[PDB]
């Protein structure tokens, strides 16, 4: 059964084996988010997307750090400024 010398393993099991479903769920959610990101990239984007990055806020009116783009009021002959 068990014993005082197995307290380490008992505690570890009781506190960790219930977390394995959540760990697997987190892994699956990460896979799905990656799939959606890749589908969006294939569809097309104005500015690029960093796949393995936490957040990608860049758009036509926003930098890759969440700030407004400088020198973006007018239009440019070569198209997008990026």
């Amino acid at each position: 059964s068990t014993s005082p010398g197995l307290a380490f393993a008992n505690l570890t099991l009781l506190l960790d084996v219930p977390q394995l479903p959540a760990i697997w769920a987190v892994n699956a959610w990460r896979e799905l988010n990656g799939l959606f990101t890749e589908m969006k990239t294939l569809a097309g984007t104005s500015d690029l997307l960093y796949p393995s990055n936490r957040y990608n806020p860049q758009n036509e009116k926003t930098n890759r750090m969440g700030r407004p783009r400088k020198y973006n009021h007018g239009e440019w002959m070569f198209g997008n400024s990026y």
């Binding site: 977390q19 959540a22 769920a25 987190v26 750090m65 969440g66």
Partner: protein
């Protein structure tokens, strides 16, 4: 005699899963109501929520400079006072204004309140995640202070 002709290993798997599920239902039925519901739904659910929130979202330890800037939590229950060092989980789209409103309970906040991390002031129209990434990488301790100067 292993296996039978005409039957498939997938059918065997299905039968085994059915047996397991029926046995689980029987064992749950013939059990104490005081323990089974808790141990099977409430601890798993809470553990799942906590682990998912920790491993998916990103949190920040919030502090406030002065006591006069503390919010009014006298009405809401289970928290009748502000404590500095509070862990706050946010979404990647959250801004400084949204954070301030969440802190002050959607009520009138003091004047000229601003957020800083490692001594560096954030703009109110800035994403918290990216601002932290830039100024305090892997040190999300935020401070709310009053910028009169």
């Amino acid at each position: 005699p292993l296996g039978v002709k005409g039957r498939s290993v997938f059918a065997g798997m299905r039968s085994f899963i059915g047996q397991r599920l029926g046995r689980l239902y029987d064992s749950f039925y013939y059990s104490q109501s005081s323990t089974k519901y808790v141990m099977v739904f409430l601890f798993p659910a809470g553990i799942f929520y906590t682990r998912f929130r920790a491993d998916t979202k990103l949190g920040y330890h919030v502090f406030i400079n002065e006591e006069k800037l503390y919010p009014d939590y006298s009405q809401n229950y289970f928290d009748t006072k502000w404590t500095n060092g509070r862990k706050v989980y946010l979404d990647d789209e959250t801004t400084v204004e949204q954070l301030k409103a969440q802190i002050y309970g959607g009520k009138a906040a003091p004047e000229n309140v601003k957020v800083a991390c490692r001594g560096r002031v954030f703009e109110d129209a800035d994403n918290v995640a990216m601002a932290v990434r830039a100024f305090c990488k892997r040190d999300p301790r935020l401070l709310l202070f009053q910028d009169n100067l």
